[PDB]
Design a protein around this ligand. Structure first.
Ligand code: HEC
Ligand code: HEC
Ligand code: HEC
Ligand code: HEC
Ligand SMILES: [Ca+2]
Ligand SMILES: [Ca+2]
Ligand SMILES: [Ca+2]
Ligand SMILES: [Ca+2]
Ligand SMILES: [Cl-]
Ligand SMILES: [Cl-]
Ligand SMILES: [Zn+2]
Ligand SMILES: [Zn+2]
Lengths: 768, 770
């Protein structure tokens, strides 16, 4: 049947219509695959989602007719997350074998034979899916490349099995909630790099598994978990992303439904991350799309880390509030792992009182319909019916994986590091108007601290987030700053919800508000727009990432060009600063290490660092990771306070800046110094996520401390009712030089941390 | 051991310390009572909480040593909510007899004998508890009263106690349009003779002669009040649903609060205010620990759920700083916690979904060793047997319905049947109406502008009408889903505000103090008004006065009833309250109308037609006690004709808003409820929270409404409805189109919540019909 578009004949669908062709190619459903889990907190740890390793679980095949059940995973200690192939004769899953090796990705035929290990990783792997890239039809494709200046010739063939997109986490890392996992999406070459060689002309760059004949490449760099990938009708990857960055979303964060390319070139939000939307802090997981009405249907859990909950839906074509539905939707139990069929039916895992089973869903009654299978001794979930899957279109990839770009002219793969000689992979990004936003003027860091027009935004600060890695368990403590702004998300490293960060660099902004820059690739980052004093007016709280050689465009600053609105037609100066030279990949300037000011401390220009190192016409700066600058309170700030402040500020004259770097014990926890505790102290009647008495994290322009150091009213948000005292006033603007003052500014805009150097270091801190 | 205070001997507690005495008076526990429910949506309907009737459930007794189990309730088809007596030889519960009668309150001995029926109520009853009032030590007690007069003993009554339970009538809808509205009832077990012992007159209320019991309604909330329990100082701890109008993001909140056993002084404890933890989470089954004095309650993910995690806040200082999460790291579901004087606790727990009884572990922040878990039953509501210490009983100044008790001679009196008043009445006073912890903001529970003393001229007093729609062809839920109300709208209104009317207006003194006499035993709230007669701030909640009672507050949500001590204030209203010895109260009754000057500014207050056996027990004219004659603003009867006369001529489809078409219903998404003008005026605006307002209308703030802004042709508040308000080109002055009465009729309509059908039940005025 036609769905998205009309077909060749009445009642028939065009091959371009994914939904319709899926309807026509489905066929009768007889057998289904699903996961049976032990009923235990350890057997069904859905409270630890996305990190879900239902130890003791198995994958089973059930016949809807003969009612006979077969266990396919008997050789596995744990097995889960089944996903069938296109033909339905084989399927991929996640699990750990009895022989050991950890939780990995495997695939096996539907009859139970032909087992193969797709991943050997240090970490845990989950939820594999098949993405057919360069394989639409069954057979062998041909590999062709250029002679390096010769012609294009054929070399060899490859069986077309496509790729595998999965979610996985490394070993010994912490997310922004300090959970001991960080998940991200990986693309996997099933043929050992030769699929990517067929598509590109070079084998996949990434981590190679020659013993398994596979290769993996990390396509998503988010500092928190990205999980449960699926397929969009237009051939992209649909998944759930945790946006936890700093104090955003009331210091809670949100789990959003979003999509990205299979190489991770174009991540964009679908629903759930933006203010005014529905579900709040609810967890959103296991999202899939209906074929008939094209509905994104997902599990909405009451807790952000829960994998069980209700079922909700939003239109795929129009993911807005107007199309939001709560499917189930009341009485009285729990739902999980929904699976929409092309014939418009649906399979859900339902627990009426407390124990899950496979059930047909009923849309008329808004609840679970007739029963498929339930064992009382098992929790039955993740139904995966056996049928024929129509392959979504595969999108062209301009990256060969790690360090590897593919030119737009000759389409020839190139290594930016090993060959071209760059210290690190580097992409570019461009914003056509930095002043253009849908956000109002407000106290919160993601909003505007003041009205800004074209010319008011002088530059932008680009910041890289650092993963939280703490091998030594004696030198790190979570909740050390609970008395400070951070609360439960604070730690030995920071008294705020902001984890460790560093400055990628500064880039100037044109008089029309446009900006473009070259910077590091495959690293989590975000930006801040700056006024003529070099303070952040507005912060983008999220983790952006660039694949090698990839540019990224946006109309505005959270304007809707990547969310709900069409791109605005804009003729921008930055466009001509991007690529003008024949001999270059990109001619855009790299992020500068410093800024330079005038006498007053107003913005003058950008200043090169000493990190400067023929495929680009501009000085290459800021690609060396070991040289990347940050602002540490102990190394940078505290000495300034000891020199020019502590003398005049003691217990009698608050805030108390004295005592040097000596740690102070609060609630039996010694983490920070006196000055840090004083400056990070909360204020009555003020949201800690906004800031404290003297400090607003990731807004310096809103901070009382900065207000006093400049002795001016900097923003439209007053820190308190009485800022400057009437009598006894003393002007603080002459106490510091521009270097020290702007060092404090940078410290606050970075999130006002304590330890900005990842891992245990020599500088003072928590010890037990 | 001593807890709150010190004892006479080291290691022992004073008799004034409740939590201290309870540790000694408890005794060993060899047996427990608990409820077993079938595992089904209809067998354990916790999703419909508080309205919970676990059909097919039994109450059982279990010995912790001999491991024996016995079914006491076998005569009942449905039985639940166990509560043990003080000695532990008997208990009370909610049950459905196999012979019928509905779900009522019952009590029986621990052995299974002595079955007695407490409630015949037409409706549902559950969660009964014992409150010992005039009963501390076992025995009989005296009944004394006065006839020139003396105080004579008229004989005795068994001292047993009172029963506080939750109950709801039938054919009734709450603010969420659920088919139940619960409240709290006090019950005399001796047939009114215990109330006669305390007050000197039998309890007035609904009488149950054949059961020898009497009931009185102590809580008038339009939404459900449930799960009553005991405070260490002798009050009633329970859960309250505050849903009123668009309150709290339009979804309302479920708060833990306390009230006197006669319902004289309800006050919030935790969960109802901005900044507090838990949001829209349900808070139910709240109990208090003896050792560290912690309120421990079930925090449900969903507002209507009776299962969830376990949360706690200190009873002594119920604030965010004492808040903590007791559970949740195992992913299991908890319900029905029961703290012990031994600093132990019994919890109902389903790890992977079979609910059972478990000993709680505080060191693990989760459930401990198993007590009894049957795979075939949800095992919950554990109620261990032991001797319970009795909380203090507070003096009641009301004998129940229509009955007050004099503060001078302490003599019960009937305000209606005897004194000749149309309805029972009471008083309330605020010392400063301009005093608040709330900032200036767009939301109706905040200030629309800064107000000082003298800026607040008067106050509007509004009575909430319960939603009763027996005929299903005349009423539809979600008729206004395209409007501001959303799914909480109905055939009655396009907003979340249900039907209500005007109790009346009362002037405010120059210092911000106000006091008034008004109806009692009815739900109501107040609005402070500026010199144009518009609400600056609305109190969104449901307040109720017992007969002859009166209630004081320092300020307007200043925190005198929440987290702050009363501010010392010498108020002008204090001298307008009771100055005469021959009167109960000398304070003025709520006036029906207003008087304005030629400028439209507040001149004063005006008497209505309802003025009234009657006796000389008050100095002021009696106004607004007739429920029949209580005035409200209805859009069809009042506003629409004004719109047709003065408006619709220039407003058609080509000139928004479209006010034409008369009262003819407009079908929207297959539902025809309201007219064209109503649909137009209640239309939402892009980028604006509908909980605040729409294009032309902000419910329960007229001063924030663009329509009113234009009708007065001025900027009324500090919250602008939109960026472009007054056109610079082709503008037309709208201020002289209406008289003062019409314009202020619109103002009143908007301040009331901008309803459509304000007349409860099906009427002759145009509306939804199938
Ligand atoms: C080193 C550059 C610093 C910093 C960072 C601060 N001070 Fe001072 N200070 C002094 C006096 C007499 C006052 C009170 C009078 C007035 O505020 O004008 C202050 C006040 C502050 C504040 C404001 C605190 C508040 O209002 O709550 C802040 C944030 C602050 N200081 C920071 C005196 C001196 C002084 C001479 C004795 C010197 C040197 C400093 N201060 C240095 C610093
Ligand atoms: C013809 C003399 C009119 C009468 C009778 C009424 N209105 Fe009117 N209205 C009229 C015009 C020409 C305009 C254009 C805009 C302007 O401000 O002049 C309006 C506008 C309004 C508006 C503002 C709509 C908006 O800005 O979105 C409102 C709220 C409005 N009119 C309401 C209104 C009411 C309540 C009337 C009866 C008292 C009424 N109008 C009569 C012309 C005429
Ligand atoms: C001004 C700062 C910018 C600029 C220059 C860019 N973005 Fe966007 N961004 C911005 C804000 C205020 C937010 C939301 C912060 C919060 O706490 O909610 C975001 C967020 C994103 C996201 C997350 C999804 C979403 O919120 O819509 C993505 C994805 C994203 N930003 C991408 C993006 C792109 C492609 C840009 C072009 C270079 C870009 N940002 C620039 C503000 C700003
Ligand atoms: C100005 C209007 C008043 C006055 C004259 C009184 N109160 Fe209070 N009240 C008020 C607001 C704005 C709110 C919160 C509304 C909301 O959250 O949407 C309340 C709330 C209450 C409550 C509910 C519990 C709580 O919020 O603390 C109770 C109970 C209560 N108010 C009682 C009360 C009493 C005893 C008063 C003395 C006459 C009183 N109110 C006056 C604002 C106002
Ligand atoms: Ca099952
Ligand atoms: Ca460190
Ligand atoms: Ca059980
Ligand atoms: Ca009616
Ligand atoms: Cl944008
Ligand atoms: Cl108050
Ligand atoms: Zn957003
Ligand atoms: Zn409140």
């Amino acid at each position: 049947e036609p769905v998205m578009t009309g077909g060749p004949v009445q009642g028939k669908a065009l091959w371009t219509d994914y939904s319709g062709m899926s309807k026509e190619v489905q066929g009768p459903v007889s057998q289904i695959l699903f996961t049976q889990s032990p009923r235990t907190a350890k057997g069904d740890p859905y409270q630890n989602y996305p990190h879900y390793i239902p130890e003791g679980s198995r994958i089973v095949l059930f016949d809807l007719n003969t009612k006979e059940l077969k266990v396919l995973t008997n050789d596995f200690a744990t097995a889960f997350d089944p996903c069938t192939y296109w033909d339905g004769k084989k399927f991929a899953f996640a699990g750990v074998h009895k022989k050991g090796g950890g939780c990995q990705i495997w695939e096996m035929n539907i009859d139970g034979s032909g087992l193969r290990q797709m991943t050997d990783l240090k970490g845990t792997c989950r939820s594999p899916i098949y993405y057919a890239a360069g394989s639409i039809e069954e057979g062998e494709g041909r590999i062709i490349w250029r002679d390096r200046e010769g012609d294009w010739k054929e070399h060899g063939m490859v069986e077309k099995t496509g790729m595998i997109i999965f979610s996985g986490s490394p070993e010994g890392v912490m997310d922004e909630f300090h959970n001991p996992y960080a998940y991200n999406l990986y693309r996997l070459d099933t043929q050992g790099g030769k699929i990517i060689q067929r598509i590109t002309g070079h084998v996949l760059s990434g981590i190679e598994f020659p013993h398994l004949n596979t290769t993996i490449d990390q396509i998503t760099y988010n500092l928190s978990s990205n999980f449960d990938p699926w397929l969009t009708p237009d051939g992209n990857i649909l998944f759930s992303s945790v946006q936890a960055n700093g104090s955003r979303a009331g210091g809670e964060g949100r789990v959003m439904i979003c999509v990205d390319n299979w190489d991770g070139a174009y991540p964009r939000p679908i629903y759930g991350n933006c203010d005014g939307e529905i579900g709040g802090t609810s967890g959103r997981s296991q999202a899939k799309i209906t074929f008939g009405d094209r509905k994104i249907v997902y599990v909405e859990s009451p807790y952000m880390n829960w994998g069980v909950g209700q079922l909700a839906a939003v239109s795929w074509d129009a993911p807005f509030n107007k199309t939001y539905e709560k499917l189930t939707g009341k009485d009285g139990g729990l739902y999980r792992s929904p699976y929409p069929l092309p014939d418009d039916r649906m399979l859900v895992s339902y627990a009426e009182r407390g124990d899950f089973g496979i059930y047909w869903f009923n849309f008329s009654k808004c609840a679970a319909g007739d029963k498929v299978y339930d064992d009382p001794n098992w929790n039955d979930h993740q139904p995966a019916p056996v049928y024929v899957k129509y392959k979504p279109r595969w999108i062209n990839t301009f990256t060969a994986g790690k360090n590897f770009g593919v030119t737009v002219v000759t389409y020839q793969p190139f290594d930016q590091v090993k060959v071209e000689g760059y210290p690190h992979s580097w992409g570019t990004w461009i914003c056509f108007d930095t002043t253009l936003s849908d956000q109002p003027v407000g106290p919160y860091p993601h909003q505007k601290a003041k009205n800004v027009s074209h010319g008011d935004i002088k530059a932008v600060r680009i910041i890289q987030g650092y993963q939280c890695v703490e091998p030594d368990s004696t030198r790190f403590r979570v909740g050390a700053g609970a008395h400070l702004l951070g609360g439960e998300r604070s730690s030995s490293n920071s008294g705020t919800a902001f984890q460790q960060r560093g400055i990628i660099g500064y880039q100037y902004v044109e008089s029309d508000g446009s900006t473009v820059t070259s910077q590091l690739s495959d690293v989590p980052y975000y930006m801040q727009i700056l006024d003529d004093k070099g303070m952040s007016v507005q912060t983008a709280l999220t983790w952006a990432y660039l694949r090698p050689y990839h540019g990224r465009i946006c109309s505005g600053c959270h304007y809707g060009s990547y969310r709900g609105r069409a791109f605005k037609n804009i003729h921008a100066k930055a466009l001509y600063n991007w690529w003008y030279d024949d001999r270059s990949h990109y001619d855009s300037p790299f992020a500068f290490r410093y800024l330079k000011f005038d006498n007053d401390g107003n913005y003058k220009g950008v200043k090169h660092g000493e990190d400067v190192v023929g495929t680009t016409s501009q000085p290459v700066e800021g690609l060396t990771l070991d040289k990347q600058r940050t602002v540490d309170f102990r190394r940078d700030i505290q000495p300034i306070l000891d020199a020019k402040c502590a003398m005049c500020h003691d217990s009698n004259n608050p805030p108390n800046l004295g005592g040097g770097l000596e740690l102070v014990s609060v609630d039996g926890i010694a983490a920070y110094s006196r000055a840090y505790n004083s400056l990070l102290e909360p204020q009555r009647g003020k949201d800690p996520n906004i800031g404290g008495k003297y400090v607003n994290p990731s807004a310096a322009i809103n901070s009382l401390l900065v207000w006093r150091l400049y002795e001016a009213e900097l923003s439209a948000n007053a820190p308190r009712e009485k800022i400057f005292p009437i009598e006894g006033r003393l002007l603080h603007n002459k106490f510091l030089t521009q270097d020290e003052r702007y060092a404090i500014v940078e410290w606050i805009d970075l999130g006002a941390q304590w330890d900005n150097i990842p891992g245990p270091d020599f500088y003072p801190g928590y010890l037990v």
